Every structure is written in C-alpha cells, then in structure tokens.
Design a protein around this ligand. Structure first.
Ligand SMILES: Nc1nc2c(ncn2[C@@H]2O[C@H](CO)[C@@H](O)[C@H]2OP(=O)(O)O)c(=O)[nH]1
Ligand SMILES: [Ca+2]
Length: 104
C-alpha cells in the first residue's frame, strides 16, 4: 500500500522522510541543485490545508526512490517548513500550468 499516491506514483512514509531530509539539509546549507534550484520557496496560493506554518519549501520526490540530485525533477514534491516539519506531498500531475494537487 501507498502512504501517498501522486497520480500513478506510490510512496511510502520512508520515501517522504528520506526526501525531506535531503532537501532540508540543502536548505540549512544555503545550497540548491538542478536547473530550477531545489529546494525553493513554495507559496500556498491554492490554499491546501497544511497544519504547519510557513514559510514553505518544495523539494522533488522521485518515483524511483532515489534522492533528487539535479536532473529531471519529475512532477512530485515534498513540502517542508522552516522548522523541518512536513507540510504535505503534492504533484503537478493532473493540474494545469504551474499548479498542483495534493497527493492522496
Ligand atoms: N518539472 C516540472 N516542472 C513543472 C511542471 N509543472 C510546472 N512546473 C514548473 O516549471 C518549472 C520547470 O521547467 C518550475 O518552475 C516548475 O515548478 P516547481 O519547481 O514548483 O515544480 C511539471 O509537470 N514538471
Ligand atoms: Ca519507495
């Protein structure tokens, strides 16, 4: 079973934890990877119900289970706050434009 389902991508809690950990570290270090500079600020304009406070940052989560290292980021993202607290898992999959939908 999947703790999170992004379109057809299935993620366990461990996948989310590993991704979050990597993204948070880069954040503390003042570093980014990839052409789109991850991790980067995330603005909740769609008003998802995050129970944790902003600011928020987005970091890619790979279907493969590998930690994002530059390269195609896919459509899935882990969202974390300034305090390394999980906000949610979202995806561009099935959303138009630059928008998102939450992973179920
Ligand atoms: N890789 C990727 N980027 C997308 C997609 N939809 C919108 N984007 C946005 O397009 C740019 C990449 O070319 C980024 O600003 C990225 O936003 P995020 O970084 O918030 O995902 C998508 O399906 N895939
Ligand atoms: Ca996995």
């Amino acid at each position: 079973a999947c703790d999170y389902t992004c379109g057809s991508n299935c993620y366990s809690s461990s996948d989310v934890s590993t991704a979050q950990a990597a993204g948070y570290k880069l954040h503390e270090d003042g570093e980014t990877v990839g052409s789109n500079s991850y991790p980067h600020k995330y603005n909740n304009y769609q008003g998802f119900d995050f129970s944790v406070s902003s600011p928020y940052y987005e970091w890619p989560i790979l279907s493969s289970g590998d930690v994002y290292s530059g390269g195609s980021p896919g459509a899935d993202r882990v969202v974390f706050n300034e305090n390394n607290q999980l906000a949610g898992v979202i995806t561009h999959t099935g959303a138009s434009g630059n928008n998102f939908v939450e992973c179920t």
